[PDB]
Amino acid sequence: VLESTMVCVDNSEYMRNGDFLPTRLQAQQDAVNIVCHSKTRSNPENNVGLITLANDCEVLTTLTPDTGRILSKLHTVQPKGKITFCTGIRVAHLALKHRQGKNHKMRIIAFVGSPVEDNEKDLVKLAKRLKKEKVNVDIINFGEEEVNTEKLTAFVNTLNGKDGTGSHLVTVPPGPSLADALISSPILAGE
Amino acid sequence: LGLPTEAYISVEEVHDDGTPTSKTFEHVTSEIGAEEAEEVGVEHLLRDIKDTTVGTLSQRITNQV
Amino acid sequence: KDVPGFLQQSQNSGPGQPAVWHRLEELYTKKLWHQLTLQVLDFVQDPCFAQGDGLIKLYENFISEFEHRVNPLSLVEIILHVVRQMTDPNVALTFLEKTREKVKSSDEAVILCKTAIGALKLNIGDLQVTKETIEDVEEMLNNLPGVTSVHSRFYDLSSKYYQTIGNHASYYKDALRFLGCVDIKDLPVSEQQERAFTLGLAGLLGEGVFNFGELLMHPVLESLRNTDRQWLIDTLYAFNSGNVERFQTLKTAWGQQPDLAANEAQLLRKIQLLCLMEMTFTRPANHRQLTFEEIAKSAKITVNEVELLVMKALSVGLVKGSIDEVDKRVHMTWVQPRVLDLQQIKGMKDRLEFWCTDVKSMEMLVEHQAHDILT
Structure with a gap:
C-alpha cells in the first residue's frame, strides 16, 4: 500500500531519562530504526519523513524513500526544551498535504512520551480537523503512563469517531528498549 | 507608485533602551x-x-511628477 | 550500596522533610532520571538550609550519584545555591572551576558558572581578574541567541562590578539591560525600589547618559511614585526637563545622598547642558537663534561661561550649530532627538498634514500644467 508517513519524535528534556535501556533517546532511535525498516519492507514507493517536537517544533527530513538520511539526522539530535505537539501535528499535516505522491495514504506516527500540557478542547479540535482531512495517526506513548495517557486515548477516540479505525494509540510502561512492544503492536502487526 | 520588490536583510537590533536584542x-x-x-x-x-x-x-518631467 | 544506605538512614536521621526524602528515594529507585532535578531544586531552595552544611553534604552525595545525567543548566544553578552555602572562598573557587570542567556544555551552563566565579572573586576583593572574566563572559554571551533566562545573572554581575568601580555610565547601561531582561513581577517590591533608585543615580552620574525620557517612561521607575526614596523621581523630572531652578530647589533634597555630593559640579554642568538642549528644542525651527543673555538666564550661568558650555555641547554632539560671539548669538540647527508626548505627536501630525497638502497641491499643478506632454 502506498504510504506517505512522518515520524514525530519528542526530544524534550525528559529524553535523558533512563527508564528504557539505555536512555529514552537511544530507545527512540531504535524505535525509529525499526519502524522505518518496516516502512521500507512495505511497498518501497512508501516514503518517510522526520519531525522533531521541541521548543522549535522543527522538521528534520521531509518525505524521502531512503532511510540512511533519516537515521543520520535523528542520530544528530539532542534533548532540549519542552514539547508543544499542537504545532507538531499541524506542521506534520502540512507536510502530508505537500507530498509529491497524492495517492499515498497520509500517515503521522508520533512518539510523544512526555507531559502534554495542551487543553483537551484544542486536542479534540485538532483531532477532528485531522480526521475530516483524512489523515490517520498512530500515537506511541511511554514514560508517563498516567499524566497524558487519558488525553491521548481521548484524542484517538475523537479521531476514531464511530468507525475511523485509522487512529490508534499504543502506550508502553517502562522496561527494556522500546522494541518488543513496537514489534508486537497492532500498528506494525497490520503492516 | 512603487517598485514590486521590497528587499530586507535580517540584522540583530541592539536596543539602546536595554530591551533584549532580537533579530529584525x-x-x-x-x-x-x-x-x-x-x-x-x-x-x-x-x-x-x-x-x-x-x-x-x-520623460524627465514624468519622472518628476 | 552507599547511596541507598545514606538515603534510607537520612530519611529519618536527616533534619526534616521525610516526604521529599521518600520522593527522592522512590524516583532514584524508579531510575526515571527526571523530576528528581526539579525535586532537588525545590528541596535546595526550601528553607532551613542556611547556617549549615546539610546542603553541602546533600549536594556531594547526589552529584556522586548522578552528576552525569543532569541538565547542565540545572546542575549549574543547584551548584550556585550550594556555593551560596558554605564559605572559605578558596574552596568555593576551586569547586566552581571543577564545576565548569564538569559542565563544558551549551554555553549557558559555562556562562552562569563564570558569572558565579566572577561574583565570588569580586566579593573576595580582586578586581582585575573580575574584569577579564567579565570580558570573556560577555564575549561568549554575544554568540548566544536572545531570550534564554541566563543573561540576568551576568547583567547583575556587570552592574555590581561597574558600581564598585564607580563607572556610572557602564553600570547604568548594564543595570538597565538587566531590568529589560528580567521581569518586574518576579522582583520583590523592595528590590525594584532599590534598583530603580540606584539606576536613577547612575543616570544622573552618567558621563554620556543624556537621555532621560526613556528612564522616566521605564516601568520600573514607578515603585518610587508614592515613596520616601521618591525625591529621586521629582529630581529626575526636573533634571530631564532642563530646569536648573528646580534643580537648586531640590538641592536641599538630593544633597543628602553621599554619592551625589562630590558630583554636584558634574551634575550642575550636566543640567545646564540639558537646559541648553531643552530651550533649543522648545524654540521653533526658524527663530532658533539663542542669545548669550537668554542662555545665561536659563542656566544660571554668566555670559562668559555660556560660550564654553555651548562649545562643550557641540563637542559632546548633543546639538549642532555655530557661535557668533560678536553679536553673542548661538545659531543652532539640530538637537538630540527627544521623547515626545501624545500632544506633541498630534502637533507633528498636523505639521505632516500641512506638508502633505502642499505636496499634493504641486503634484496636481505639475500634472495639469504639463498634461499635454506628460506621459
Missing part, C-alpha cells in the same frame, strides 16, 4: 535590472505597450 528585518535598496538578453526579451514583450516617442524632457 532591515531594508536594502532594491531595483529592477536586466542582462542584455533579459532586456532584449522584455523590450520585445513590451514592444507595443512601452512608449519611446516621448522625448528626454517629457
Whole structure:
C-alpha cells in the first residue's frame, strides 16, 4: 500500500531519562530504526519523513524513500526544551498535504512520551480537523503512563469517531528498549 | 507608485533602551535590472505597450511628477 | 550500596522533610532520571538550609550519584545555591572551576558558572581578574541567541562590578539591560525600589547618559511614585526637563545622598547642558537663534561661561550649530532627538498634514500644467 508517513519524535528534556535501556533517546532511535525498516519492507514507493517536537517544533527530513538520511539526522539530535505537539501535528499535516505522491495514504506516527500540557478542547479540535482531512495517526506513548495517557486515548477516540479505525494509540510502561512492544503492536502487526 | 520588490536583510537590533536584542528585518535598496538578453526579451514583450516617442524632457518631467 | 544506605538512614536521621526524602528515594529507585532535578531544586531552595552544611553534604552525595545525567543548566544553578552555602572562598573557587570542567556544555551552563566565579572573586576583593572574566563572559554571551533566562545573572554581575568601580555610565547601561531582561513581577517590591533608585543615580552620574525620557517612561521607575526614596523621581523630572531652578530647589533634597555630593559640579554642568538642549528644542525651527543673555538666564550661568558650555555641547554632539560671539548669538540647527508626548505627536501630525497638502497641491499643478506632454 502506498504510504506517505512522518515520524514525530519528542526530544524534550525528559529524553535523558533512563527508564528504557539505555536512555529514552537511544530507545527512540531504535524505535525509529525499526519502524522505518518496516516502512521500507512495505511497498518501497512508501516514503518517510522526520519531525522533531521541541521548543522549535522543527522538521528534520521531509518525505524521502531512503532511510540512511533519516537515521543520520535523528542520530544528530539532542534533548532540549519542552514539547508543544499542537504545532507538531499541524506542521506534520502540512507536510502530508505537500507530498509529491497524492495517492499515498497520509500517515503521522508520533512518539510523544512526555507531559502534554495542551487543553483537551484544542486536542479534540485538532483531532477532528485531522480526521475530516483524512489523515490517520498512530500515537506511541511511554514514560508517563498516567499524566497524558487519558488525553491521548481521548484524542484517538475523537479521531476514531464511530468507525475511523485509522487512529490508534499504543502506550508502553517502562522496561527494556522500546522494541518488543513496537514489534508486537497492532500498528506494525497490520503492516 | 512603487517598485514590486521590497528587499530586507535580517540584522540583530541592539536596543539602546536595554530591551533584549532580537533579530529584525532591515531594508536594502532594491531595483529592477536586466542582462542584455533579459532586456532584449522584455523590450520585445513590451514592444507595443512601452512608449519611446516621448522625448528626454517629457520623460524627465514624468519622472518628476 | 552507599547511596541507598545514606538515603534510607537520612530519611529519618536527616533534619526534616521525610516526604521529599521518600520522593527522592522512590524516583532514584524508579531510575526515571527526571523530576528528581526539579525535586532537588525545590528541596535546595526550601528553607532551613542556611547556617549549615546539610546542603553541602546533600549536594556531594547526589552529584556522586548522578552528576552525569543532569541538565547542565540545572546542575549549574543547584551548584550556585550550594556555593551560596558554605564559605572559605578558596574552596568555593576551586569547586566552581571543577564545576565548569564538569559542565563544558551549551554555553549557558559555562556562562552562569563564570558569572558565579566572577561574583565570588569580586566579593573576595580582586578586581582585575573580575574584569577579564567579565570580558570573556560577555564575549561568549554575544554568540548566544536572545531570550534564554541566563543573561540576568551576568547583567547583575556587570552592574555590581561597574558600581564598585564607580563607572556610572557602564553600570547604568548594564543595570538597565538587566531590568529589560528580567521581569518586574518576579522582583520583590523592595528590590525594584532599590534598583530603580540606584539606576536613577547612575543616570544622573552618567558621563554620556543624556537621555532621560526613556528612564522616566521605564516601568520600573514607578515603585518610587508614592515613596520616601521618591525625591529621586521629582529630581529626575526636573533634571530631564532642563530646569536648573528646580534643580537648586531640590538641592536641599538630593544633597543628602553621599554619592551625589562630590558630583554636584558634574551634575550642575550636566543640567545646564540639558537646559541648553531643552530651550533649543522648545524654540521653533526658524527663530532658533539663542542669545548669550537668554542662555545665561536659563542656566544660571554668566555670559562668559555660556560660550564654553555651548562649545562643550557641540563637542559632546548633543546639538549642532555655530557661535557668533560678536553679536553673542548661538545659531543652532539640530538637537538630540527627544521623547515626545501624545500632544506633541498630534502637533507633528498636523505639521505632516500641512506638508502633505502642499505636496499634493504641486503634484496636481505639475500634472495639469504639463498634461499635454506628460506621459
